[PDB]
Design a binder for this molecule. Structure first.
Ligand SMILES: Nc1ncnc2c1ncn2[C@@H]1O[C@H](CSCC[C@H](N)C(=O)O)[C@@H](O)[C@H]1O
Length: 241
């Protein structure tokens, strides 16, 4: 059994469950867990438990295959319905993007922890999208479709707790991400916002204390321009000064 981080990393990445995960994520979690000074066996188990939570319930290999099939048939809505977070968004999708884009439709969007949401941006006619996430299966769904459509979408397999997004754009989307980052590393959510090379951002939280947390913690160089509940998301439009 794995008795060090390197061997544990190899083991986890070889598993059917975790093979599509960003290797940096696996190493980050293993290294943090190793620092708790438990046995190698307990440490690897603790790491797997965390990775299970990080992978979550958003997609499966079969749902990803079905999303690809949907895209091949031109059924973008069906593909969107096959990631749990976009499925939640479906009913009010155009209301949401109408709200975000009311003043201006951006040329280039950075979609941070993108899930399958870039497919919605395609349908909104966004010219250029860069999305990052830690599950390569997401890129494996979106990228072949983007190439078929001559659409300027790029996917990065990137853990934002390992390295900040380096790209630049007109608008960053940070949907349903800040809470999970904060739970995992205190202070990381606002640090992510401070790192983004966009003049404006749209940040969302699940909703029917996130509002209080966000409004109380948003660094002074940002201004909240609007705030609205649309479907089961609370959305803030912010500008960086
Ligand atoms: N450290 C990390 N770096 C990058 N992405 C991460 C991450 N931890 C979790 N994620 C990703 O965060 C996403 C949360 S679900 C939200 C997906 C998308 N933003 C949407 O709203 O539709 C998942 O796709 C998950 O894989």
């Amino acid at each position: 059994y794995p008795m060090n981080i390197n061997d544990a990393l190899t083991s986890i990445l070889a598993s059917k469950k975790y093979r599509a995960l960003c290797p940096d994520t696996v190493r980050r979690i293993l290294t943090e867990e190793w620092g708790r000074h438990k046995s190698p066996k307990q440490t690897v188990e603790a790491a797997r438990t965390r990775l299970h939570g990080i992978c979550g319930a958003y997609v499966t290999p079969e749902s990803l295959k079905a999303a690809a099939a949907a895209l091949s048939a031109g059924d973008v809505k069906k593909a969107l319905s096959l990631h749990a977070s976009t499925k939640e968004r479906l009913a009010e999708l155009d209301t949401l993007y109408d709200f975000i884009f009311s003043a201006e439709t951006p040329r280039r969007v950075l979609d941070i922890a993108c899930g399958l949401n870039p497919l919605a941006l395609y349908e909104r006619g966004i010219a250029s999208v860069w999305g990052c996430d830690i599950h390569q299966g997401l890129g494996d769904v979106i990228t072949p479709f983007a190439r078929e459509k001559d659409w300027d979408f790029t996917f990065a397999l990137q853990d934002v707790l390992c390295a900040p997004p380096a790209e630049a754009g007109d608008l960053a989307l940070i949907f349903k991400l800040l809470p999970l980052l904060e739970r995992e590393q205190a202070g990381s959510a606002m640090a992510l916002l401070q790192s983004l090379n966009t003049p404006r951002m749209a940040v969302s939280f699940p909703t029917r204390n996130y509002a209080a947390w966000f409004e109380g913690g948003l660094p002074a160089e940002f201004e909240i321009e609007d705030k609205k509940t649309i479907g089961t998301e609370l959305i803030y439009l912010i500008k960086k000064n």
